[PDB]
Design an enzyme around this catalytic site. Structure first.
Site, PDB file in Angstrom:
ATOM      1  CB  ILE A   1      28.561  14.613 -30.097  1.00 51.14           C
ATOM      2  CG1 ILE A   1      28.335  14.006 -31.518  1.00 51.14           C
ATOM      3  CG2 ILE A   1      27.466  15.663 -29.819  1.00 51.14           C
ATOM      4  CD1 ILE A   1      29.234  12.838 -31.799  1.00 51.14           C
ATOM      5  CG  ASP A   2      27.838  19.227 -32.009  1.00 52.12           C
ATOM      6  OD1 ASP A   2      27.460  19.292 -30.824  1.00 52.12           O
ATOM      7  OD2 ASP A   2      27.060  19.435 -32.957  1.00 52.12           O
ATOM      8  N   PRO A   3      30.559  21.161 -30.846  1.00 49.43           N
ATOM      9  CG  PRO A   3      31.841  22.662 -32.025  1.00 49.43           C
ATOM     10  CD  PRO A   3      30.970  21.464 -32.223  1.00 49.43           C
TER      11      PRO A   3
END
Lengths: 51, 221
Positions: free
Chosen positions: B70-72
């Site tokens: 989903i994201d870092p």
């Protein structure tokens, strides 16, 4: 489910029927077509089609 | 360097370098980025702004699978999705154990999804505020759809990690693409351990007359 051992079993069976594609009874062909249906619904798009 | 191009934006990192395969989205990416970046930049981020877009240096035309989070990582993101250069992040260690169990490779020092032929690792949102997953969702939204739709024009299979995070992913994409959503490596009850996504991806590739992924290439020795 998408990612379970059960899903993998079904996809491996689909692949096996796809590689033969030489159905000698109504069961095999309806199994193939119904697996295509399930895989398409489960994964949105798959690379094999009904026959 | 000739297969690489750059465009200018109005906020840090000011220059975005990209492989030719990304050319069709770059104009839109500039426009979108210019409208949100200053909001984004008020926060310290993972990764740092100079690494936000380094994955656009990857070709797409040789890619068969996108592996998408989903994201870092909330801290220490490098701009390469899932990358942990000294092999410290739980998610990359878990992914590696799965691959170890699958391939029978038991002695390794690292694992990186970015050195595997045919795989593009991807973060749906390209930053978060340090320490806080999903905190930049609102800013990345249009960009994220732009870029993932571009990726999915090229790959045969999209594998998303996070049942909750990606429960609505089909709605963000236009054209259908083979999409597997599995557990995130941090899921409750060791559920990621039981997940057979990497094997599933390979069967799906075969169903599409594509070469399966050699997951053991990701190992660092």
């Amino acid at each position: 489910a998408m990612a379970s051992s059960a899903d993998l079993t079904n996809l491996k069976e689909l692949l096996s029927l796809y590689k033969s594609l030489r159905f000698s009874d109504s069961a095999a062909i309806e199994k193939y077509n119904s697996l295509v249906e399930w895989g398409t619904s489960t994964y949105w798009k798959i690379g094999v089609q009904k026959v | 360097q000739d297969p690489m191009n750059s465009v200018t934006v109005s906020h840090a990192p000011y220059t975005i370098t990209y492989h030719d395969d990304w050319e069709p989205v770059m104009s839109q990416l500039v426009e979108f980025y210019n409208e949100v970046a200053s909001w984004l930049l008020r926060d310290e981020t993972s990764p740092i702004p100079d690494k936000f877009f380094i994955q656009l240096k990857q070709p797409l035309r040789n890619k068969r699978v996108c592996v998408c989070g989903i994201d870092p990582y909330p801290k220490d993101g490098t701009g390469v999705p899932f990358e942990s250069p000294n092999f410290t992040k739980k998610s990359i260690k878990e992914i590696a154990s799965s691959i170890s169990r699958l391939t029978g490779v038991i002695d390794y020092k690292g694992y990186n999804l970015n050195i595997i032929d045919g795989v593009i690792p991807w973060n749906y949102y390209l930053s978060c505020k340090l320490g806080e997953t999903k905190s930049h969702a609102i800013y990345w939204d249009k960009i994220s759809k732009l870029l993932l739709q571009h990726i999915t024009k090229h790959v045969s299979v999209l594998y998303c990690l996070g049942k909750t995070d990606f429960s609505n992913i089909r709605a963000k994409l236009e054209s259908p693409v083979t999409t597997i959503v599995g557990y995130h490596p941090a899921a409750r009850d060791r559920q990621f351990e039981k997940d057979r996504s990497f094997e599933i991806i390979n069967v799906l590739l075969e169903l599409d007359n594509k070469v399966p992924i050699n997951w053991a290439q990701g190992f660092i020795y």
